[PDB]
From a paper:
Non-structural protein 1 (nsp1), a unique viral and conserved leader protein, is a crucial virulence factor for causing host mRNA degradation, suppressing interferon (IFN) expression and host antiviral signalling pathways. SARS-CoV-2 nsp1 is a protein of 180 residues consisting of an N-terminal domain (residues 1 to 128), followed by a linker region (residues 129 to 148) and a smaller C-terminal domain (residues 149 to 180). Here, we report a variety of fragment hits against the N-terminal domain of SARS-CoV-2 nsp1 identified by fragment-based screening via X-ray crystallography. We identified two ligand-binding sites on nsp1, one deep and one shallow pocket, which are not conserved between the three medically relevant SARS, SARS-CoV-2 and MERS coronaviruses.
Author numbering: 10 to 126
Write the structure that this text describes.
Amino acid sequence: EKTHVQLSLPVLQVRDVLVRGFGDSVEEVLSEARQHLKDGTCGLVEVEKGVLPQLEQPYVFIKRSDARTAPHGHVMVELVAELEGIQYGRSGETLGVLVPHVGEIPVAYRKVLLRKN
Ligand SMILES: Nc1nc(-c2ccc(O)cc2)cs1
């Protein structure tokens, strides 16, 4: 497994998302997020007012992991989970919140260089 992988994630509007989180514990949501990333079944919801209360906790965020540079168009990112106000991981700015993708029509694709850790 290389340390990072280039992915193009479908960006979903929150009201379209059918499965509003990955599971019921921090460890489960991180595990499931990683599996859906592997399978090409992970979407991204950009955070704006009203978005997080419409999604299910624990949340999985992708956050920016370096400023140096975004290789080949793909922002370098890592996963950080949140439950009841506590975060598991420390990283940079949030690009969005990951959710299962089950065929919803995206509004854009977001290119990222994902750290697998
Ligand atoms: N070849 C590819 N590997 C992945 C991947 C692999 C491992 C993870 O933990 C998360 C994503 C996505 S695409």
